[PDB]
RNA sequence: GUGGGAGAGGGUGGUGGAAUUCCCGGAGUAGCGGUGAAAUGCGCAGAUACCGGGAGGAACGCCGAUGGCGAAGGCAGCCACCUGGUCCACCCGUGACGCUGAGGCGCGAAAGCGUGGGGAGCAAACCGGAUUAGAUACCCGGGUAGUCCACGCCCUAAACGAUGCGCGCUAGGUCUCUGGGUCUCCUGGGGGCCGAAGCUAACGCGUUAAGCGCGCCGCCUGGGGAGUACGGCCGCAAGGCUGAAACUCAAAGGAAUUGACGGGGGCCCGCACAAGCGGUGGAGCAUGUGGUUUAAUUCGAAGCAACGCGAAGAACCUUAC
């Protein structure tokens, strides 16, 4: 369904292109480190495109996860 | 015989056999159990009765110990799976939380034929 | 029954007590639908309970009947591959009718040469909780768990 | 040309985390593994499950699409460098400089070959376990070449859209990727679906033509023999390219139709199974039959749907022997 409210509404304006702005891209990822689909983050395909390649850097950085352990169950 | 209390339990589900772990907070195990030890042989093993089975074995073993407080942390899809998260629970042990920890590859090595199918 | 949930055929209550159970008994002691000396036969039982016992007969048999129904039974079953012998709860109606043609049997089993006697005898030793009948429910019930590593083919 | 845009397009160097295997340490004990069941196998020289450390090789989860890039093969972790194609806007420059393209030259998945290197996982061959009537197989346990890198070679493919390239003309609707605009929508380039006219054997195609036209290239001419033989050219080899004949068949074949069928799917029935009660199969006898025997043992009936059947009446008769 996924019919819970679209990461990029419940935000300001903020450059998509920041591999730095943890307080943000962190909304963009699922209760793992996964990269949220665009039927959650509801970005464009070019947005959305724009946000992996900033997702990845701050991975690498370390400032984002490359994966959570799911908690519940 | 070391009086731990609280620790955490490893869940190794799959689904050929069902293995626990009870450990410390530390991680090093204090007492185990499987499908086997309950009794079991080959394919009853695997069965969601062996881990409950299984699971309270790990539990009373760890009892001993002193265990009051375990942390399940589950790993694989194996049936029982979720047998054994129940056992645990309703073991007396304080079961303070769950955690999928099931390893993943972000594609890494072949798989064997039997898992490949999927290019 | 392909097509329906065929109903549960009604019953006569009993020519004496007055319960459906006695009759239901009474006729599984029949047979070649000779009803008469299945009657009679039950009912020389239920004297003899008397005879050997404080309480009235229509209670004890009530008590034999509840000892020997089996909660739990195993049922066969294919699982592409094998024949699995599955556990799983016995519905209060298959419940009565194997109690009732597991007594029948038990006794009719026994050594005592007088039909009635065996059912009287039968009887009393459910009511303890002792007898064929009463085993069979046993074994039924040891089987049934005892292959509970395959309670989950719910079926 | 100037200004803008998107991209897993290519090459090189670097680099990140997850996972598998191995090694080291800890803690822990009797099994793990694997299957339809199992076994081989591994484990008290302590395996598996758990924690920490290390080494190494290969591949990049989510994003990810029904998406994009490339002429094709094909290309996805991240970073920088080097480099190809391409689209839009402006209308600025040249002024037919165009299209196609035998041969030539280059590129060309996988497997394979050569030299050297590497080798974690996987895995032809192979070594074993199981299955089977047999199992030189499917399943399980191992495992070498290989898979990876460099350099050289090979040149194939369901190398597919089974659809050569270019240009013009011929309704629309809708979804989508990327550019522009006065940004309800109009407009340009790409990917899909449905459809006008029209085309087609049919299925289908239908501004991404399989429509209507023009230009240039390649190719077909019944099936088998045969992608074989021979010759030639290329290759280290495997082999590649080109490519017959004798002989032989009336077919081989495309699409669609009605059925039948499926160890295909959905829905649904029947004493079909299940539930249950009685019985046959054992015995003796009755009866029919096979077989055998006989001078004759009259004939027919044959899985279901032949066998207490034609026989609702064989001592003579019936009665056919
Ligand atoms: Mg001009
Ligand atoms: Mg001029
Ligand atoms: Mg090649
Ligand atoms: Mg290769
Ligand atoms: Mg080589
Ligand atoms: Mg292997
Ligand atoms: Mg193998
Ligand atoms: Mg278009
Ligand atoms: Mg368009
Ligand atoms: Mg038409
Ligand atoms: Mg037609
Ligand atoms: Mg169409
Ligand atoms: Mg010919
Ligand atoms: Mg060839
Ligand atoms: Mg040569
Ligand atoms: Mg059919
Ligand atoms: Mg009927
Ligand atoms: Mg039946
Ligand atoms: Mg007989
Ligand atoms: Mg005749």
Same mark, same amino acid.
């Given at each position: 369904?996924?019919?819970?409210?679209?990461?990029?509404?419940?935000?300001?304006?903020?450059?998509?292109?920041?591999?730095?702005?943890?307080?943000?891209?962190?909304?963009?990822?699922?209760?793992?480190?996964?990269?949220?689909?665009?039927?959650?983050?509801?970005?464009?395909?070019?947005?959305?495109?724009?946000?992996?390649?900033?997702?990845?850097?701050?991975?690498?950085?370390?400032?984002?996860?490359?994966?959570?352990?799911?908690?519940?169950? | 015989?070391?009086?731990?209390?609280?620790?955490?339990?490893?869940?190794?589900?799959?689904?050929?056999?069902?293995?626990?772990?009870?450990?410390?907070?530390?991680?090093?195990?204090?007492?185990?159990?499987?499908?086997?030890?309950?009794?079991?042989?080959?394919?009853?093993?695997?069965?969601?009765?062996?881990?409950?089975?299984?699971?309270?074995?790990?539990?009373?073993?760890?009892?001993?110990?002193?265990?009051?407080?375990?942390?399940?942390?589950?790993?694989?899809?194996?049936?029982?799976?979720?047998?054994?998260?129940?056992?645990?629970?309703?073991?007396?042990?304080?079961?303070?939380?769950?955690?999928?920890?099931?390893?993943?590859?972000?594609?890494?090595?072949?798989? =064997? =034929?039997?898992?490949? =199918?999927?290019? | 029954?392909?097509?329906?949930?065929?109903?549960?055929?009604?019953?006569?209550?009993?020519?004496?007590?007055?319960?459906?159970?006695?009759?239901?008994?009474?006729?599984?002691?029949?047979?070649?639908?000779?009803?008469?000396?299945?009657?009679?036969?039950?009912?020389?039982?239920?004297?003899?309970?008397?005879?050997?016992?404080?309480?009235?007969?229509?209670?004890?048999?009530?008590?034999?009947?509840?000892?020997?129904?089996?909660?739990?039974?195993?049922?066969?079953?294919?699982?592409?591959?094998?024949?699995?012998?599955?556990?799983?709860?016995?519905?209060?109606?298959?419940?009565?009718?194997?109690?009732?043609?597991?007594?029948?049997?038990?006794?009719?089993?026994?050594?005592?040469?007088?039909?009635?006697?065996?059912?009287?005898?039968?009887?009393?030793?459910?009511?303890?909780?002792?007898?064929?009948?009463?085993?069979?429910?046993?074994?039924?019930?040891?089987?049934?768990?005892?292959?509970?590593?395959?309670?989950?083919?719910?079926?």
């Amino acid at each position: 369904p996924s019919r819970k409210a679209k990461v990029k509404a419940t935000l300001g304006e903020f450059d998509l292109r920041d591999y730095r702005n943890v307080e943000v891209l962190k909304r963009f990822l699922s209760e793992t480190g996964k990269i949220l689909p665009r039927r959650r983050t509801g970005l464009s395909g070019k947005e959305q495109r724009i946000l992996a390649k900033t997702i990845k850097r701050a991975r690498i950085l370390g400032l984002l996860p490359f994966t959570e352990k799911l908690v519940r169950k | 015989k070391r009086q731990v209390a609280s620790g955490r339990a490893y869940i190794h589900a799959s689904y050929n056999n069902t293995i626990v772990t009870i450990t410390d907070p530390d991680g090093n195990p204090i007492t185990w159990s499987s499908g086997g030890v309950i009794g079991y042989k080959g394919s009853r093993k695997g069965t969601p009765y062996a881990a409950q089975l299984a699971a309270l074995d790990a539990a009373k073993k760890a009892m001993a110990y002193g265990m009051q407080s375990v942390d399940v942390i589950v790993r694989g899809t194996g049936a029982g799976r979720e047998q054994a998260i129940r056992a645990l629970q309703a073991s007396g042990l304080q079961v303070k939380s769950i955690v999928d920890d099931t390893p993943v590859p972000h594609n890494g090595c072949r798989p =064997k =034929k039997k898992f490949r =199918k999927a290019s | 029954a392909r097509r329906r949930r065929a109903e549960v055929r009604q019953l006569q209550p009993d020519l004496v007590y007055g319960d459906v159970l006695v009759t239901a008994f009474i006729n599984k002691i029949m047979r070649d639908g000779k009803k008469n000396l299945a009657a009679r036969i039950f009912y020389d039982a239920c004297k003899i309970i008397q005879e050997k016992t404080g309480q009235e007969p229509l209670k004890v048999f009530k008590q034999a009947v509840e000892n020997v129904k089996p909660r739990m039974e195993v049922r066969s079953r294919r699982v592409g591959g094998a024949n699995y012998q599955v556990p799983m709860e016995v519905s209060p109606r298959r419940q009565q009718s194997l109690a009732l043609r597991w007594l029948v049997q038990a006794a009719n089993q026994r050594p005592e040469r007088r039909a009635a006697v065996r059912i009287a005898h039968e009887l009393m030793d459910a009511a303890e909780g002792k007898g064929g009948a009463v085993k069979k429910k046993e074994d039924v019930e040891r089987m049934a768990e005892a292959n509970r590593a395959y309670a989950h083919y719910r079926w």
